[PDB]
Write a protein that binds this ligand. Structure first.
Ligand SMILES: [Mn+2]
Ligand SMILES: [Mn+2]
Ligand SMILES: [Mn+2]
Ligand SMILES: [Mn+2]
Lengths: 199, 199, 199, 199
């Protein structure tokens, strides 16, 4: 059905000094663009194999489908999770859910930071919503494996810990990047995603 | 177009005493039948998701697509790899390739046996053809991961080491099953698959 | 110090008609016995590699360490999770936690059944305790990957869905085995494991 | 047995302009150093669990052992695979093996480049020696999974395609990094590793 690179909801430098403009521009215009481009190529090749009934070709295409498809899913959410007007704490029912499920907002930040810094290799840290249990949940995903597609949790807030998300600015020091990104979390967007999870 | 369960090319009791009739009937009429049906179900849900551009739904279906699709691929080859007219050693160029790539037929049997008995959990041992290198190659695959779809090798001979392939007759002693199955290998079919790889 | 095969706490035929005596004897005296012995073999080779600083040899041994070590861990819990005095529903705080975290005992049974029947290939379904969140949690594990070692959840109740756990009696119909096993769950043991988690 | 960060066999700027000095210094003094440091911590924790017979703790430590242990193995080989005096083509039996197993030196470069650029996420491209088959073989490894520990192939030449190996200089354009690194391949070292594989 054709996938497209979404416009960034802000200027490439809007998240400075926490994530610099060179990273944002590369991350959106090169990395996410490649995922979209390679996803469209892979989807067309899957339509051919499916019409041909070639199951071997379908299975051979699965790694590229999950990698680029997950990449598209994850980054499309990620851009909306950040804002130049972000930072601080959420309000209302989301903040109450965070206190109820994690103890406090500070304890939640520790848990999500720990999950993000604990990713060995490329991956993502996620705050998600468990619809079956009706409460928040933190999970980590490898490479571009998307949260809902691989675990069923509804994504609320994602932290990209691929090296291209921080290396130009923070080099190997991923914890400095994790501390900085809290200043640009768009809690308005995370609240919207949380409210959508409830009828 | 759909996928269908192939008829077994021989009687359910044709491979006794090496593989008994209760195993052959369950393995074909229950296990393979389930894979083919569930593959068609999974493909239909993927057909819908692909047209809808729902990448999350596509990625969520990948485990079932590889598992049932691989199940169909692997067992369809497996039935042709066995025959009451089987056993012994291959002839002609396949035997020459085995001696060239593995040293001898007996050395090849140990390597394929070792790969099959070495599967921890469910899986398959494979003799394949490496098209890029132009020679034979042995590999092991977990669960129903199909050989060509996951490694690119062209399948020539597969050994199913799922417990349902032997447990009723050999119980926990997988090596006893592996010793017996050499008596029913259809080297005519494996030779046909090998000759198709070279041109 | 070594690891040893624990005696089964009941007769091999004590769980009939739900799990027959041939399965119980093979499962304990053949399968679990193999895991314990091979675990001790693998640990000794790792003991040597660790003292030698041979990291390649250590890493090569990890699949066998997790597989046989998990095999020992999982089955040692499994035997205590079953009893001829089992069946029915738990009492006290465990039942209260089940109702609180899953809605009802019946809803909990479906979720654990769904996780167990959903294992593609060999594996286990688990009811566990999340120490960080302080509540119950269901998870599925592949092959012999143990629950606490791979996810941190404390094991309370495990359902072995390897084919050797049911095939002789129920053949391919894993749901028939899952329905039967609820009749022999030792809720006294699961309650003991749950109460140890809270302090 | 205590692991230590090996000295780099050359100056941090010795591989310029192909890999810049900032990358080499970060790669050796920060990334490899961390692998060594975290490996030593993990090994000490494994000795405690092993003496305690805590198999759960051993299995929980396996990801960090493979990650940091593999990281140490892979980078220790990598530094020796490069040299300011490198580039060009190998001579003697290694060059003959490359021509025999891959067709030509240029075709081999294409195959190893393709394997390296094909790594989705973090990982490594390897030219290895298959001792059982007695010929060269190309393989790719995810994250820090070491070649010999996970596949049995003897490592001859490794290409690190983690983003920290090239991103500061080449950004997202991994193919430009792969083309440049051929100018500093230490074929003297690769030849030594190849000759050691033969009696
Ligand atoms: Mn990214
Ligand atoms: Mn089968
Ligand atoms: Mn078992
Ligand atoms: Mn590196």
């Amino acid at each position: 059905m054709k996938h497209s690179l979404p416009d960034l909801p802000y200027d490439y430098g809007a998240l400075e000094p926490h994530i610099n403009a060179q990273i944002m521009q590369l991350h959106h215009s090169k990395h996410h663009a490649a995922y979209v481009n390679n996803l469209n190529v892979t989807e067309e090749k899957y339509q051919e194999a499916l019409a041909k009934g070639d199951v071997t070709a379908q299975i051979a295409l699965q790694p590229a489908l999950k990698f680029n498809g997950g990449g598209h899913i994850n980054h499309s959410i990620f851009w909306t999770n950040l804002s130049p007007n972000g930072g601080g704490e959420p309000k209302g029912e989301l903040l109450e859910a965070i206190k109820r499920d994690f103890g406090s907002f500070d304890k939640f930040k520790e848990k999500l930071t720990a999950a993000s810094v604990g990713v060995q290799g490329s991956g993502w840290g996620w705050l998600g919503f468990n619809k079956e249990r009706g409460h928040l949940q933190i999970a980590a995903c490898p490479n571009q494996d998307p949260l809902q597609g691989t675990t069923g949790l509804i994504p609320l807030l994602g932290i990209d810990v691929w090296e291209h998300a921080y290396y130009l600015q923070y080099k190997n020091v991923r914890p400095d990047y994790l501390k900085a990104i809290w200043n640009v979390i768009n809690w308005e967007n995370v609240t919207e995603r949380y409210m959508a999870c409830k009828k």
